[PDB]
């Protein structure tokens, strides 16, 4: 979990941004449009501040 978050959090700022997530999903060839990835990100972003923090990332993966 921590390692996976670190991989996605490309700039190391303790958040996964929507742009970082689009890079993640493209890098592994997921069959999702950028817009669908944006919706995944927004639903994972419980507090709505535009960033997926580690707590949110854990709730998603669980």
Distance of CA 17 to the CA centre of its chain: 6
By CB under 5 A, tell whether 35 contacts Ca ion. Answer: no
By CB under 5 A, tell whether 9 contacts Ca ion. Answer: yes
Binding interface with ligand 3NY (CB under 6 A):
8, 16, 21, 24, 40-41, 44, 52, 57, 60
By CB under 5 A, tell whether 57 contacts Ca ion. Answer: no
Tokens of 9: 């959090």
Of these, 4, 6, 7, 13, which contacts Ca ion (CB under 5 A)? 13
Extract long-range pairs of 3-8: CB within 8 Å, 24+ residues apart. Answer: 4/57, 4/61, 5/54, 5/57, 8/57
């Amino acid at each position: 979990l921590r390692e996976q978050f670190r991989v996605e959090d490309k700039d190391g700022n303790g958040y996964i941004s929507a742009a970082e997530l689009r890079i993640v999903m493209t890098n592994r060839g997921e069959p999702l449009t950028d817009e669908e990835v944006d919706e995944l990100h927004r639903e994972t972003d419980i507090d709505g501040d535009g960033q997926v923090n580690y707590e949110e990332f854990v709730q998603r993966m669980t």
